[PDB]
């Protein structure tokens, strides 16, 4: 289904950020939480009862660490082991993170001392760059997919890390090109503050500077906050006294223009996630199809509406990626060079056209995987194709719908057009719910005209087109 | 009495910065609290109101203003006007205002609005030059006797006041001149915070900074807290968490160097000052006399008695003023004379000869109470002097006496000389707890030893300079 409409909108304006490689992420503590590793105040539960303290009573850990440094004379090795002990823990990654990885961003920001992110980006074949210290900020890994600054230290050197107050003070002076570096990116990228509590010192300290550098003209920034609920044990006034002073830290939020997402629940977080890379896995449709024949319509007939649906499909901003089949291939290429023509971006029309010849056919599978896995959405026009003299159906447009649908991409077959592809549409049509889970009635209506043959070239092509958009968005 | 030993030792160190002119005064809001002024919280308990939060529950008054700004989309009308209203009106001085403008302290801090300070200072005919604005440090007050930094603000000027979090993100850059010079002050003067929490953040990162620059090498500085007393209703276990609570502040709070007073009552704070005070008032004595007869000694073993006791009271680190009266003024001089060439300091000797003639007779009184106002213990000697042929009374030393009895300078009326040193003493014993109140076994020992009239010189000089000590210290 959808959500509000105001995150809706959220989604909305970041796909278009990330899409333009312009977004970053910044992830607190919280983003982890969800993995599996206990609560920093969990971790200072010893710590503050060897003091003399509690945790459940004390608000600002930081102190806490500070005062337990104070007693042992400024020395942090129980600290150091506590952290160490506790974020290099072995633990299975969040969808969240894989999700992130998935994502085309160029750029991560945590104060999270685990390196779920790294070997998130790590597990998606991505090269990620590192930075905790202030000389690797001087050297750029080659060919990196992104960079991740974590401007807080690492947890296999848990003598740098940013624990106790002093730490805070003098981040300052030690760590100051991280503090110039965030101070760009507030600026140059549109931010989205993910499981961050807004709490910290210093990111406190770097807002309030880039806000006093720049007042009312800040770039827009987004946050995802969960709504504050009642606790099992909990008076009403004492809860709207909670929303009410939540309210007041998310309107707080945005005088650093830091647009703050509300979300009923922890996991609502993936469902928007999911969103927001959907509507950017989608944007590249999959023209699958071949043709000797061309069912009821003549083959110039059937050859304008190609034309058009691929001149339409390119118009409304989708990537095509094409096999270039017989007697679709040629035809989408003709459609995409006109609308485009009124050079070719590589993103906008991707041809792999298939090595013809027995050693070639070997490495057909993998070149039809390679294809689709670029791709989002798969369409399937016609998809017969001449074999012993005879108009056979063709078992590659079969194929590549058996691997779209391995993908979990969505499938959309054109059974106006016939032959293998009014099976595929049959067979869809069959078990609907295993292919389009929670479907609409506009969706049903228009998969059910997608096999009415009695529709024209434009009628057809409109139908197609919102049916993509509504998968789409 | 006396107070803890850790006390005492303060006590003595801070009178010895304080004599020095290296002393400086950081006044908090809590200084003030005692004069009438309603705290801030109580101030903002409408405000808090208005956008729905309450201040009871609240811990960051900061926020809660920055708060209320949002909401009136950053607006301080009512902030402004509350401030103005309210730390404007018409209070009497505390004693704690009038003892640090009698005090030699030429450099005061303050984080309060109102101008207690600087009404204290003008009180006591002190020029005083206070400074709020940027452009204001650059021009200097004339012959000033103490600068007052108002690092927050003025009440006459609410808009420029620190009251908001937006000011303090700004006053990094706004008032740096200010964080300047604090930190020059930091390291350049020794410190006594005095009504502070240390809870400020702008002090927070002065602090912090100072650190960074010195390290282990910071200078000195000493501050005042309350201990914390329990509630009327509250539980043992919570009280004690509070008092281990303020023991980690504390701790926390010598980490910069800052040595932390706990003082039982508020009313301390008052006992500390007079304290400090009266070892710096006490250090000048009044050499009072006047003789043509020497009692049961010769002229010249009286002479050396006077010269001895002026020479060791010199030796002491005492500053003598004498009237020069005919014959102790003499032997003072001599006796100081002889120890200061073993230049004259216009400090250690202040000679104020009374001009002779009927003219100068008519400002005799005025010219009295000058020099004696200018000491804190005044010393009394024989008192005859030669009238119509005959040795009468001298009524200069009893009008000397009346005079230093009026200002509640400590009188040592030296018995074992005679006359109407005699007398003086007789008057002082008859009622001791007028002239001596709370006196010790050792006071009146000693009290009673200076009628000894038995004592050779060395007794009497050394029971008179242990009866000095004991005043001053
Ligand atoms: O300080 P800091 O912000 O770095 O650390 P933190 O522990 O204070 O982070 C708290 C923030 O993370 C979020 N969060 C907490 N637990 C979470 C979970 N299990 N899943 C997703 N988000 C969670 C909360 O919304 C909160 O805003
Ligand atoms: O912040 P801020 O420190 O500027 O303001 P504040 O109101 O927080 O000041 C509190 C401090 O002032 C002291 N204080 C409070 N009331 C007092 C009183 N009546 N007399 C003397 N001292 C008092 C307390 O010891 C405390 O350390
Ligand atoms: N002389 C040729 N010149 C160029 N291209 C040729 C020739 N001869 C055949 N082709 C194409 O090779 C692909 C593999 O051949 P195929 O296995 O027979 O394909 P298919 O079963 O028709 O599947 C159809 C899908 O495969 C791909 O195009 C097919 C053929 O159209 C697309 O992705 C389709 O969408
Ligand atoms: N030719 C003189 N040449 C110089 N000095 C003289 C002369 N003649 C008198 N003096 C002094 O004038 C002061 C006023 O005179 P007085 O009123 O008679 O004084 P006093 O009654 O003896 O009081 C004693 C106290 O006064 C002051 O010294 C006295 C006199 O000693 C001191 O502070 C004493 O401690």
């Not at 299975?92 to 001392?113: F, G, M, Q, V």
């Not at 050693?359 to 959405?377: F, L, S």
């Amino acid at each position: 289904m959808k959500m509000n409409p105001i995150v809706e909108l959220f989604i909305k304006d970041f796909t278009k950020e990330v899409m333009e490689e312009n977004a970053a992420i910044f992830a607190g503590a919280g983003l982890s939480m969800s993995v599996g590793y206990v609560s920093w105040a969990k971790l200072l539960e010893p710590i503050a009862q060897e003091i003399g303290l509690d945790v459940n009573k004390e608000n600002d850990l930081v102190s806490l660490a500070q005062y337990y440094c104070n007693e042992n004379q400024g020395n942090r090795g129980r600290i150091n082991q506590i952290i160490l002990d506790e974020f290099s823990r072995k633990v299975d990654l969040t969808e969240n993170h894989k999700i992130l990885a998935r994502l085309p961003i160029h750029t991560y920001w945590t104060t999270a001392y685990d390196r779920l992110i790294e070997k998130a980006l790590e597990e998606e074949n991505k090269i990620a760059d590192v930075k905790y210290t202030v000389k690797q900020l001087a050297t750029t890994k080659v060919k990196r997919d992104a960079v991740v600054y974590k401007m807080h230290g690492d947890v296999e050197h848990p003598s740098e890390a940013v624990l106790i107050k002093d730490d805070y003070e003098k981040y300052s002076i030690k760590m100051d090109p991280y503090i110039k570096a965030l101070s760009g990116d507030l600026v140059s990228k549109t931010f989205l503050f993910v499981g961050f509590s807004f709490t910290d010192p210093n990111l406190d300290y770097i807002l309030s500077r880039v806000r006093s550098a720049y007042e009312r003209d800040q770039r827009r920034h987004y946050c995802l906050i969960k709504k504050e609920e009642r606790r099992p044990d909990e008076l009403e006034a004492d809860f709207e006294y909670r929303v009410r002073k939540q309210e007041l830290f998310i309107s707080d939020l945005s005088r650093f223009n830091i647009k703050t997402i509300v979300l009923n629940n922890y996991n609502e977080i993936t469902e928007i996630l999911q969103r927001i890379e959907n509507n950017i896995k989608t944007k590249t449709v999959f023209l699958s199809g071949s043709a000797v024949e061309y069912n009821h319509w003549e083959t110039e007939h059937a050859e304008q509406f190609i034309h058009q649906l691929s001149k339409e499909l390119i118009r409304k901003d989708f990537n095509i990626v094409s096999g270039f089949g017989l007697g679709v291939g040629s035809f989408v290429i003709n459609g995409v060079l006109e609308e485009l023509y009124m050079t070719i971006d590589d993103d906008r029309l991707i041809l792999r056209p298939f090595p013809q010849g027995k050693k070639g056919e070997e490495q057909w599978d993998k070149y039809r995987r390679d294809m689709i896995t670029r791709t989002g959405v798969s369409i399937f026009l016609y998809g017969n194709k001449i074999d012993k003299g005879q108009v056979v159906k063709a078992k590659g447009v079969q194929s590549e719908f058996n691997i779209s649908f391995e993908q979990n991409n969505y499938v959309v077959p054109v059974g106006a057009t016939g032959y293998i592809a009014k099976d595929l549409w049959n067979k869809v049509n069959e078990e609907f719910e295993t292919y389009y889970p929670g479907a609409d009635a506009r969706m049903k209506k228009l998969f059910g005209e997608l096999n009415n043959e009695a529709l024209s070239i434009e009628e057809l092509i409109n139908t197609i087109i919102e049916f993509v958009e509504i998968l789409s968005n």
